[PDB]
Design a protein around this nucleic acid. Structure first.
Lengths: 81, 112, 50
RNA sequence: AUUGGCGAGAGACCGAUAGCGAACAAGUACAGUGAUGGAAAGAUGAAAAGAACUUUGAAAAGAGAGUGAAAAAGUACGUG
RNA sequence: GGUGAACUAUGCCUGAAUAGGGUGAAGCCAGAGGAAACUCUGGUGGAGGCUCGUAGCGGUUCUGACGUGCAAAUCGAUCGU
RNA sequence: UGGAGGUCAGUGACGAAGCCUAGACCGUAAGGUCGGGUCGAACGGCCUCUAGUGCAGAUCUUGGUGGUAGUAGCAAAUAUUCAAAUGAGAACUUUGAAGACUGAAGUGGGGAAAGGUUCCACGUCAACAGCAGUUGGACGUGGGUUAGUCGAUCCUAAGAGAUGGGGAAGCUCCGUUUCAAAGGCCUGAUUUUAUGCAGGCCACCAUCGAAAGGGAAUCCGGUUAAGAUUCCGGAACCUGGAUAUGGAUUCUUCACGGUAACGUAACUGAAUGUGGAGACGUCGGCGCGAGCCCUGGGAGGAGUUAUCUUUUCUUCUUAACAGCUUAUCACCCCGGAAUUGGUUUAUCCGGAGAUGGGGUCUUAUGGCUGGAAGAGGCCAGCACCUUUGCUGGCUCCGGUGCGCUUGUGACGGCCCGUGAAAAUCCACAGGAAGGAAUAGUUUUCAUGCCAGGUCGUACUGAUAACCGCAGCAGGUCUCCAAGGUGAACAGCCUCUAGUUGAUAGAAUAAUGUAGAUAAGGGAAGUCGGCAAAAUAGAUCCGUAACUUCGGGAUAAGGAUUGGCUCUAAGGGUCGGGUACGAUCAACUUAGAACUGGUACGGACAAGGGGAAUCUGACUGUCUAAUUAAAACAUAGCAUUGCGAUGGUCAGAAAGUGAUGUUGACGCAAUG
RNA sequence: UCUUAAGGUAGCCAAAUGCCUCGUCAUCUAAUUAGUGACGCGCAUGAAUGGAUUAACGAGAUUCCCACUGUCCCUAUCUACUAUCUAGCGAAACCACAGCCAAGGGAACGGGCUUGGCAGAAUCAGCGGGGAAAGAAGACCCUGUUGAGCUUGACUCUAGUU
RNA sequence: CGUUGGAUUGUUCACCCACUAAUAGGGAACGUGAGCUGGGUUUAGACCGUCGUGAGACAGGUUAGUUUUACCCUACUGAUG
RNA sequence: UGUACAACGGGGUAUUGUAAGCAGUAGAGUAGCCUUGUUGUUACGAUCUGCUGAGAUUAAGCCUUUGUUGUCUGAUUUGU
RNA sequence: AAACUUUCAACAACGGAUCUCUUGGUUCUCGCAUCGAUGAAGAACGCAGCGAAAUGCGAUACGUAAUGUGAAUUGCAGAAUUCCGUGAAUCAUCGAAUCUUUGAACGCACAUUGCGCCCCUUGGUAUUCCAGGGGGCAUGCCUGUUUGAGCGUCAUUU
């Protein structure tokens, strides 16, 4: 049986959590994340994957630094009190 | 009777997962984990077992005293007694033959 | 498994503390439409699959 | 030039199966090993005033009573 | 342009698993017959991609059950090893 | 019909829009207008503008809902019953009692992957547990995982992969030591001057990769609701870190002894080099040990005892660690061996020294003692409404074996197969560096000091904790393994432990599914003996054609088998004058009477056989889920290419690759 | 002699290969398109596209014999669980509307239409005649200026190689 | 009102052996697969012969090859009302 | 309130095949006494014999309660 | 005659159509130019008196500082004269900071909360060992510094 009896045999994760994105997409044997391309320098992205680009892009996170850049520009990148 | 279980998390009958059954003062049978048996050190030339040298694991050899790891003879803990005897005899005899060969070569050249 | 790694154990802890019903006072807060924890998880129902 | 970013003003546009997938804890919940896929879900009332109290029931609840302009608005709520 | 060898196919590395019987190969001991050559007999021993047959692995037939099933391939008995 | 411009200073919270109404009117109709209910904030006529503008269908889309229908069904895994309690409520919860089951390759006790809190305690019906539920792996709230010693961590395996370099427009590809200038431990320097310096050795040739490989070291008893080789008590060990105390030379500086194998409490340490351990398959029998099983005496407890049984069942245990003592092999001295001898289960060994005598060693393994009886276990006794203790006895001595399993040892088969590594730790030739007289050497001899981080640890591991949509008869790696029968971890029954779970009640029509039986016939059934039956274990007798001499063969074909009472054979330890017996009952075989409803491998278990033909030689493999075959493979046979600047095959390219750690007895391609 | 180089040798055969064909002869049976043994002008056997043979082996195909029997004559009975009735729980496939026939005509096989037969609530268990029952935009066939896998002396090219 | 039992063949037809009173011929969607069976034909595996350069072809021969569902309405058979 | 019905027990009937227990100088045999061997006896012993066509079962789809013991006024509907 | 079946109405029933609504979309237009090794975008784990998310934030953790405003926040509860005031706030503004583990991610690794090495301090009668506190150690390239290498090569040598 290629169905249920063979499904009984799947207990070895081919993917684990990825350091760069916590997506369970890090292929263990290939040592590459199938989602972000880790450990390559460039995050994996394709122009046929517009939904994927939406999921992984600027503004989908906290923007811990980039959120204040517009305010600082609007103020002229001032310094002082 | 009383059935035992493995004491470590290794569930397999591996060479490093060997157990004996022992009876404890609590009256119950327990699995004791038995380490690998040590192999006798071998002679460097014969490859035969060296007597007067203890059987220990290599790291166990570091804790013991020097007299357990060698013999009072030259080449003691490294070569067999018969090996050392054969090498002494061979060394002396071949060097004597070297002297004789040197003398005979010199004397035949002087005659020539 | 019993012999976990710290990353997996940390994910376990995060999921365990997340898995709790909604506090009773957030319901009473004004302009509040949240009535229950929608992101609730049971270990049999839905696997985290990490 | 500018289907991105920031700010602003509009429309003979759409009006919750429409308009962006998403008017809501929406790229969320869940499905896949993975690349990826990806919903449903708005409306009490002006104000909770969200039904004290009495009775039957083990209880849910019912029957009275009560608030309310309306309970032919009772949270399973605008007409339904 | 990307994802997949968690099933499966094949190689490699490192581990683990496999009752009890039948047969009785080399090697070996002893004995008998014979003029000799040699032949023969009894033991011993424990071979084999041998064999009956558990666990295991598989899946022949019933074209059995079930076939809006326990199950998108299972169940039972018979079977192969 | 939705929007837009004008207008009706249009309708409306004194009720707009929507919606319901076998009420009315109008129009041929599309439709318009109104009456009555519901309600709650906007809407319409007219002249024009505009379009995402009209539905019965598209196996249309999305939601919702039917008949079927209280129907199919909830029937595999032997099975439940009585009482009490709790409760509103009990077939299902709990506790007793009974009956059972798994039957030690378990329905038991642990783990690996996976899950992730399911573990454990406390509260009840909303959901869930295809009946119920007071129960739950559900719900809510909480608690729970303690390490120097167990793992990870360290090492390397197949392999992955930076660098140097070289490709590629490039994302990147190759490559892993290559056409590269590739780094780290001791005293002098260790303060008018720093880690600067003729101070030395030199030359791993990144790194990642195993919770089953290699590897430093922990055990017992107790303790929790839930953790324990982790906590506590006791007792140890390993690793890493300067002087100390004792013990070992000094009118011979790094010890003595023994013929020797070698011994001992020690008994210097650098480069350099070398050796060993790490470090290895499988099968067969033999030997030894551990545990278990079996059994005798004795000291306790329990069961029946209308008849019997010095009966039947159960406790009598000794962990790591320390010391001494024990070894088959192997080795050493004396010694000379044919009348060859010693010897194993298994012709192996001996003038290259057998036998004999005497010794040396490894310590697997066992014994004794310490640990340690103070522990644990088994018995008996003291306040009786306070979170509860104490005291007395025992815990003894033995046997047995083709027993089971495990480990070890000496061996013997097997291969055109000979069963690779690395870290790490020891050792061996060398004396480079020191001193002899209130000290100079020893931290490889004893004793004493300190520390040992980080992360995992709960639980299930499966007919309910994983995967299969699920609490799915499926799938999923492994360890321990009692008694009887028996060849047997097969089938049957039973101790320990666990479970009694699967919706139930009543009745017993047809037809089913599963299991059986059948007169006489015996394949006449049918495509076909499909299915079933018959056979079957063991002992003895007997056994053909053919043959590649190995087989065929369990050929075919016959007989016997119980119980009881006996008989016989098969063995270990002991001595002689001043041709032998023993407190020994450990199981195999053969025979003899006797005996019974012609029974007896009495259940279980367990080949049907023969004569031929076609085909494939055989074991082996494949169409997971309709084809296991005559198909594929195979050994054997033959052909082909190629001598390396090569053949065959990769790569976009490459200072790139596979064969190739290769070399014609080889690679590669075929039949 | 001719095609086209040679003409099928050893063997084997109505063979898993023989149409004619159930070939002819023998045997096996009471009877045999089966089986085996022979015979071959063999549509269209044949030699590593291997021929012939072959012990042992075979969940391979086939014939016969013995044993055995419910396959059958020719059926009968028994057990467990169902079905069945009840408590609880409770789907689905299907569904234009529906559901009595005969003939006629009709898209030439009607539940409806025409002419006849007829025709009485509500229903339960079975059943498999019908619903040209259900399951799937026939997989056969054809068509389409619709494909795809494979092959080659197709057309047009191409990596490699020379 | 009857019109059989068999050998061979998947066969319809055949053709024999017999019995018989007789072994007449046909239809019912070439009656009858939610009635069976699956021998044949008629998927995919495989062998052969001939054909084809080849892939492949061959109402030529061989061997192995999943036969699903009624609980509804009618009809029918019985059973209440 | 009937020689009514039922639950047990004898009988009839039938099925099987001779029950437990007790006894026997029965039984193939295995091991000795001394009171000097025609029954002295023990630790046993499958089977055999007698009581014993015994015992057990017998309507659940075969009968009486001449024996014992009990049962006999519960709920719905019916218009000429 | 009832039951049953159909049709209609009333009321009551899952359903959520219609109507009205709308802090949302979608198009058009105008203006602007500002991410990152001074560590970005993204990820993980945590932080609230009582909370897990595109709320906010980082062990100074629903935030600190500065500034403005001027009395809140609010579901409940609270340190406090916080109220004619250097002063409430889930306020606004925002120029000072903090900014855990990561990430181009930088000591080497990373399916490990794994291993180093270098300075200074403290503790253990310690420059070496262990521990604690702090600060560091990537690669390519540029300019400069210092130390070098090469008979590649220039001025002195019987």
């Amino acid at each position: 049986g290629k169905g249920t009896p063979s499904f009984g045999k799947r207990h070895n994760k081919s993917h684990t959590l990825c350091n760069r994105c916590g997506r369970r997409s890090f292929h263990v044997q290939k040592k590459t994340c199938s989602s972000c391309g880790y450990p390559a320098a460039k995050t994996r992205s394709y122009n046929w994957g517009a939904k994927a680009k939406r999921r992984h892009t600027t503004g989908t996170g906290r923007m811990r630094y980039l959120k204040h850049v517009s305010r600082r520009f609007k103020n002229g990148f001032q310094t002082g009190s | 009777a009383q059935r035992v279980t493995f004491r470590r998390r290794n569930p397999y009958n591996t060479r490093s997962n060997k157990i004996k059954v022992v009876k404890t003062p609590g009256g119950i049978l327990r699995a004791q984990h038995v380490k690998k048996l040590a192999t006798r050190p071998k002679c460097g030339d014969c490859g035969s077992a060296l007597q007067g040298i203890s059987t220990l694991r290599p790291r166990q050899y570091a804790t013991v005293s020097k007299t357990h790891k060698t013999v009072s003879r030259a080449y003691g803990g490294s070569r067999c007694a018969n090996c050392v005897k054969e090498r002494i005899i061979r060394a002396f005899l071949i060097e004597e033959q070297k002297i004789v060969k040197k003398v005979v070569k010199e004397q035949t050249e002087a005659a020539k | 498994a019993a012999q976990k790694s710290f990353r997996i154990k940390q994910k376990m802890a995060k999921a365990k503390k997340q898995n709790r019903p909604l506090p009773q006072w957030i319901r009473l807060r004004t302009n509040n439409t949240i009535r229950y924890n929608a992101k609730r998880r049971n270990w049999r129902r839905t696997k985290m699959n990490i």
